[PDB]
Amino acid sequence: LPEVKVEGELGGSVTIKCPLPEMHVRIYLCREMAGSGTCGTVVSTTNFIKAEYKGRVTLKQYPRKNLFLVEVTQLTESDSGVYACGAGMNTDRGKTQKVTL
Amino acid sequence: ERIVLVDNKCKCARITSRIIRSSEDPNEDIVERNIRIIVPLNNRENISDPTSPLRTRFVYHLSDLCKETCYTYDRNKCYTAVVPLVYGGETKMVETALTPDACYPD
Amino acid sequence: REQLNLRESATITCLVTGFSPADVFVQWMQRGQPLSPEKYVTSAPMPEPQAPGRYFAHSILTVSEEEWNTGETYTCVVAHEALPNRVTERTVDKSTGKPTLYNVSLVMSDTAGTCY
Amino acid sequence: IRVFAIPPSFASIFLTKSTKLTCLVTDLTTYDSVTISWTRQNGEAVKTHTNISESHPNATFSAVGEASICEDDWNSGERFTCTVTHTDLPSPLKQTISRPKGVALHRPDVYLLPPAREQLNLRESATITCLVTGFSPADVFVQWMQRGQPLSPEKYVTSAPMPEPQAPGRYFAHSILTVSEEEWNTGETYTCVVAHEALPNRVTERTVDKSTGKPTLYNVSLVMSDTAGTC
Amino acid sequence: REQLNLRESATITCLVTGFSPADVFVQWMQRGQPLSPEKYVTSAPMPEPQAPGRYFAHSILTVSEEEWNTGETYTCVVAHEALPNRVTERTVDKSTGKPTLYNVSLVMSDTA
Amino acid sequence: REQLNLRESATITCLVTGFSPADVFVQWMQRGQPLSPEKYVTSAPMPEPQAPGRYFAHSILTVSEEEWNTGETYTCVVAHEALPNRVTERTVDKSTGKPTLYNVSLVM
Amino acid sequence: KSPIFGPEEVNSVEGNSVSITCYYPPTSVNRHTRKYWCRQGARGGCITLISSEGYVSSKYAGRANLTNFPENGTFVVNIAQLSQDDSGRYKCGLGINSRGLSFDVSLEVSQGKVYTVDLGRTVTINCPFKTENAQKRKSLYKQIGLYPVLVIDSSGYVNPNYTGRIRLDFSVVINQLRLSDAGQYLCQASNKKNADLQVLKPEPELVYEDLRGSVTFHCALGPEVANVAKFLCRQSSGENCDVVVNTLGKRAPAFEGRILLNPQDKDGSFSVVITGLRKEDAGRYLCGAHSDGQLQEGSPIQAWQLFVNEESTIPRSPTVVKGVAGGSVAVLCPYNRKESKSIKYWCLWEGAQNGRCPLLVDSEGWVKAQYEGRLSLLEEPGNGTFTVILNQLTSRDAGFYWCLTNGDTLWRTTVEIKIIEGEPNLKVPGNVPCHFPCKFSSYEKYWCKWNNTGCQALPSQDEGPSKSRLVSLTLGWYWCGVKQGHFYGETAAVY
Numbered sequence A: 001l002p003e004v005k006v007e008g009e010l011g012g013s014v015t016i017k018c019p020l021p022e023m024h025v026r027i028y029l030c031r032e033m034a035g036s037g038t039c040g041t042v043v044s045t046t047n048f049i050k051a052e053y054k055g056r057v058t059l060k061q062y063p064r065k066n067l068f069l070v071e072v073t074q075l076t077e078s079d080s081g082v083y084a085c086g087a088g089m090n091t092d093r094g095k096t097q098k099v100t101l
Numbered sequence B: 001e002r003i004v005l006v007d008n009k010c011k012c013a014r015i016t017s018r019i020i021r022s023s024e025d026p027n028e029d030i031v032e033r034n035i036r037i038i039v040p041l042n043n044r045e046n047i048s049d050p051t052s053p054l055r056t057r058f059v060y061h062l063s064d065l066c067k068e069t070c071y072t073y074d075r076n077k078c079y080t081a082v083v084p085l086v087y088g089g090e091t092k093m094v095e096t097a098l099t100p101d102a103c104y105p106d
Numbered sequence C: 001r002e003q004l005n006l007r008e009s010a011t012i013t014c015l016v017t018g019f020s021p022a023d024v025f026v027q028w029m030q031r032g033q034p035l036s037p038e039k040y041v042t043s044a045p046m047p048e049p050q051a052p053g054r055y056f057a058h059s060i061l062t063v064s065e066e067e068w069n070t071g072e073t074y075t076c077v078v079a080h081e082a083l084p085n086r087v088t089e090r091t092v093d094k095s096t097g098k099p100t101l102y103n104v105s106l107v108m109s110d111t112a113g114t115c116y
Numbered sequence D: 001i002r003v004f005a006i007p008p009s010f011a012s013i014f015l016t017k018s019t020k021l022t023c024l025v026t027d028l029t030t031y032d033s034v035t036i037s038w039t040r041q042n043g044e045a046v047k048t049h050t051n052i053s054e055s056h057p058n059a060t061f062s063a064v065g066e067a068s069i070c071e072d073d074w075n076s077g078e079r080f081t082c083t084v085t086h087t088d089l090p091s092p093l094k095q096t097i098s099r100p101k102g103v104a105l106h107r108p109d110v111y112l113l114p115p116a117r118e119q120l121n122l123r124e125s126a127t128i129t130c131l132v133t134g135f136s137p138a139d140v141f142v143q144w145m146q147r148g149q150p151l152s153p154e155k156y157v158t159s160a161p162m163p164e165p166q167a168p169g170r171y172f173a174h175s176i177l178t179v180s181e182e183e184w185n186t187g188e189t190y191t192c193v194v195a196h197e198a199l200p201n202r203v204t205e206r207t208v209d210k211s212t213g214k215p216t217l218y219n220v221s222l223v224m225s226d227t228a229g230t231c
Numbered sequence E: 001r002e003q004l005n006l007r008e009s010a011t012i013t014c015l016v017t018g019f020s021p022a023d024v025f026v027q028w029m030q031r032g033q034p035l036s037p038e039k040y041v042t043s044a045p046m047p048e049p050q051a052p053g054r055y056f057a058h059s060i061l062t063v064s065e066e067e068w069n070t071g072e073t074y075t076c077v078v079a080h081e082a083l084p085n086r087v088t089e090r091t092v093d094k095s096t097g098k099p100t101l102y103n104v105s106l107v108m109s110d111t112a
Numbered sequence F: 001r002e003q004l005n006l007r008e009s010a011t012i013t014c015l016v017t018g019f020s021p022a023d024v025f026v027q028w029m030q031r032g033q034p035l036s037p038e039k040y041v042t043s044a045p046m047p048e049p050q051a052p053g054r055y056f057a058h059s060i061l062t063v064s065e066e067e068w069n070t071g072e073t074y075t076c077v078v079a080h081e082a083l084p085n086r087v088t089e090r091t092v093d094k095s096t097g098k099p100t101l102y103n104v105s106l107v108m
Numbered sequence G: 001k002s003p004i005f006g007p008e009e010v011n012s013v014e015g016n017s018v019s020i021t022c023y024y025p026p027t028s029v030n031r032h033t034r035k036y037w038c039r040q041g042a043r044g045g046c047i048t049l050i051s052s053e054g055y056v057s058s059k060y061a062g063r064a065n066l067t068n069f070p071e072n073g074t075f076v077v078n079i080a081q082l083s084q085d086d087s088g089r090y091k092c093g094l095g096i097n098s099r100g101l102s103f104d105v106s107l108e109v110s111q112g113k114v115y116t117v118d119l120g121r122t123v124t125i126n127c128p129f130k131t132e133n134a135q136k137r138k139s140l141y142k143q144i145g146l147y148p149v150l151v152i153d154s155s156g157y158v159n160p161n162y163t164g165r166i167r168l169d170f171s172v173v174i175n176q177l178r179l180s181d182a183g184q185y186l187c188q189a190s191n192k193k194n195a196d197l198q199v200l201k202p203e204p205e206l207v208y209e210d211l212r213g214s215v216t217f218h219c220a221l222g223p224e225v226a227n228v229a230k231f232l233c234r235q236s237s238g239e240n241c242d243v244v245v246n247t248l249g250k251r252a253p254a255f256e257g258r259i260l261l262n263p264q265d266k267d268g269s270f271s272v273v274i275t276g277l278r279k280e281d282a283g284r285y286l287c288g289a290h291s292d293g294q295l296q297e298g299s300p301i302q303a304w305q306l307f308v309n310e311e312s313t314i315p316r317s318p319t320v321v322k323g324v325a326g327g328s329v330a331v332l333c334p335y336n337r338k339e340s341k342s343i344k345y346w347c348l349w350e351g352a353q354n355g356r357c358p359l360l361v362d363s364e365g366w367v368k369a370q371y372e373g374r375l376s377l378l379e380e381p382g383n384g385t386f387t388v389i390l391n392q393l394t395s396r397d398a399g400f401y402w403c404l405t406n407g408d409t410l411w412r413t414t415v416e417i418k419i420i421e422g423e424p425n426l427k428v429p430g431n432v433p434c435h436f437p438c439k440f441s442s443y444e445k446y447w448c449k450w451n452n453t454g455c456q457a458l459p460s461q462d463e464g465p466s467k468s469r470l471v472s473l474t475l476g477w478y479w480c481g482v483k484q485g486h487f488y489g490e491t492a493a494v495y
């Protein structure tokens, strides 16, 4: 559980690296939900992308050394939560690649 | 009639479910959940390390159990540690048995 | 709960989302015995509005309320090309739904520590 | 002139893997004519001793014994003897040593009792006791280890097995360790390790320290969550 | 507390430590009347590896455990010269070591 | 506590301390009606060690242990000149002297 | 619950020693933990009365012993000098008292011419006669209401209660006694003399068996009753013998295939074998010949109290291995790793009651008529199991098959072969066709030359999927099957 500390301007873009166990059942990025304290998915292994983050993020899979990359095209200065990657059906406790912005 | 959902001996966490039939009809049967948890209260934080500090905070997330640091010794599992036993000049590392009932060689 | 209160019949629903490329045989088996095709009715797969490629489907199985009350498992099976073993048996029975009572017991003992 | 014959305890058989028989002669005149071979039940002997000292702190003679006996010989219990060659004795003296015969084999129970509250109030030193009750045969070997590695034997002082009051064939020892009260008050884990020929892996250990040993308060924090959780 | 669990017996230890002329005579008594001598056993005095002049002794009493959870008091009487009044007493009971605070804190949530 | 554990009887003490002159009257009454003189015994006044002018006194009431366990609320009354109304009553029972054993803190 | 099993209820007379044996699952922990015999005190938990670790109480001092038999998996507590005070509820178990793992034993001590016989057994009563008169008018007399209300007519007619089982001479012999028949009859010959009759229900012979295992009951009833049809109850709460197996032919529906019944021996002692025991098999099984079959009174019976451990070392065995008609199967039968095989007998079932298994194959290699050729047993997976195969999918083969061994722990694991007609996974009959689907082909399609002694692989088309497999013996019964390596997949029958 490591938490990458990234900074970028209003237009500055951030890339996120997470491990890929090659399971491919579900690998996902999760913004921290501060309004309730749990974790809410933003991108996963099936197209679901958040309405507030509509078409501003994408995922990339690499088998060379098992990369799952989140690329954010835009950035509306909205404080990015703890983008904790995880695997499996259970989002809340599948957390691993901790990232904060 | 209990359906034992889980029995985790790493944490003394047993979950069983039962449809108790209070009234003599349908749609009044209470479906239950009998979580039973035994707190060690004197076990160390590191169960296999005797000298570790005492464990005071016990966290139980019922999803990680329905499907790692343990809280209680499993009685069927042989827990051992290594201790130096210096006798003469010859210090020797020996395999002490933390749980002696379960650690007899077969 | 309302249709159970009505006292006539109950309908368990098997819903499959995703469904990349149509393709799915859904079978309803109870106690390992496949049930009659008359009882369970499936649906023609329609798309998803969350993703046009995605395809969802439903299949309802109706029984008497007493059969569900008894506790029979009636678990539905899904067969898709995507399927890892090429089948699923997702799960449900009366006593595995939302609970109404919780007596959590938290016994604390200074000489516990070796979980029987 | 003093001569003592000491049998090999189970601790020596376990840790050193060698059964050494010691017939020591001390506090006498020096002649350097010592050559002793430990004689078996018959006339033959195994080996000679080594490392005899021709000087003593009180300006006398000090001798030691040394042997290497195969362990099944000790298990069977054939009688052993030591006979002296030193010319100070007009007639050689024979010391008889052997293992007691077929006893039972119970296993110890180890209990650590922390220092009393009255002793802790004085802020001088606290005594922690290790009680070994229940064993059988009469040999047991207890070591103390302050938080980590071994305490040196000046500190504690275990007694000798002495038949338990009301349990016909079991025994009990007692080893007491004296420590500074701060040392006990900081919170150190003190461990008692017993080696016995009846335990699982011959050894076991029980540790106790400041807050485990008879604490005034229990401080817990159950934090159960996800009480629902699709199970 | 790990011996009472077995619910077999209870071994109470009287630790006299410190005396000079090693001659210490210890008895056990419960409710006045002295306990008969085949219950406890007393070790012979041994020098304290610490205090070079002093000596110590430990006397154990094995009582049936049910009795001991009846909160019965057992007292250790020890006699030695350096003792002001020539004797001294110590009393032990079921509640001699009871913890003062069971300070628990339960955090029950339905949200992970 | 030990006398209660023995279960045969129990003695309640009334320690009337720091009064002058020496004379004083001590009596007991459980519920309202004065307890019969054989039950309790009052000591004679004696000079208090610390305060030099004040003399203390004791009154012991012997009652059955089971009666004490029922919390019968006895009261020891003292009559003395220096008192404002010449009478002061103090009551005791099993309930009195029990601290807050259970301290539950429910928080939302 | 606790896998500990013992006598649910002992009883005895004062001053008589009692022996109480408690069974525990044999594991290293269970074999080396503390064995305790405690008394549930009315309010307060157990007070440990005796322990395996040399402890004995205030009482049980010189009266009691507690021996531990780890090999049997039991421990026996012996209590001598029983008294009326030593009656109540006790527990025998392992580990800590306040912990569960235990069994409850209810001990009751009863205050201390007599004839005591079991129910439904021969008994006879003597009544002294005055010889001064040749034969005074006498009959049988019963102890019911201070005056022998007519129990046998002086003319010799039998009472409706004691009908057709009494003979009188002074000796009176009655057989097939029910529980209510016995009594302290006062008989006169008028020279009144006392007598005593007692009937005792036979104590159950406790049998502690494992889940997914097998049990054997030995109904050694007396030869006399021997020829009367015999049966095997399963005693419920209220007196109703859910008859499981019957010599006459009755069969219990939820016990098909599995149960086998040995034929009666010279005497009258047959054994009943049950396999694949489950948690619902725990209960009192009552024997008893009395032609009808239903356990009815006035019949010699023998009792067993089976307890099925829910923590068993026996591994899971696939209960059914259904297969394609004309194809093949694979039956992996577990056995005790400790003791290796002697004879790997493999059987069938005649019925749910008779069910005499027909050893299709044996370690020697003898095969039955219809399975001559088309069946084999192939030891490996050696590590404590094996794999019996049966190719050429005939329908009739549907049923239950037992993986017998003549070692020690005789689990007779049972497997159900549900045959279903469908596409065959490998190709036909030689002369040499053979075919297995590409999905099934991830392994290594092989050929063996069939020998009832030992399957030996011989050359054929050894390539990739070719039409898929094939057989060639260019220059008997032969096999063309898939192999996993350690284990084995299906077969193929060529000539």
Ligand SMILES: *[C@@H]1O[C@H](CO)[C@@H](O[C@@H]2O[C@H](CO)[C@@H](O)[C@H](O)[C@H]2NC(C)=O)[C@H](O)[C@H]1NC(C)=O
Pocket: B046, B047, B048, B049
């Ligand atoms: C304490 O915890 C750690 C895990 O948090 C574990 O330590 C390793 O486990 C092996 C098991 O035998 C130990 O023998 C090794 O010594 C440990 N690795 C190391 C650091 O040596 C185990 O739970 C405990 N190990 C300790 C602290 O001795």
Ligand SMILES: *[C@@H]1O[C@H](CO)[C@@H](O)[C@H](O)[C@H]1NC(C)=O
Pocket: B056, B057, D219, D220, D221, E105
């Ligand atoms: C007791 O537990 C609470 C809650 O975890 C903690 O805040 C406190 O520091 C603990 N105190 C001690 C003495 O362990």
Ligand SMILES: *[C@@H]1O[C@H](CO)[C@@H](O)[C@H](O)[C@H]1NC(C)=O
Pocket: D219, D220, D221, E103, E104, E105
């Ligand atoms: C008691 O527990 C509470 C909460 O668990 C904690 O905040 C407090 O510090 C504890 N007190 C002591 C003396 O440990």
Ligand SMILES: *[C@@H]1O[C@H](CO)[C@@H](O)[C@H](O)[C@H]1NC(C)=O
Pocket: F103, F104, F105
């Ligand atoms: C009892 O609980 C309340 C809750 O806040 C706390 O303030 C109080 O200090 C507690 N009492 C004691 C004696 O700790």
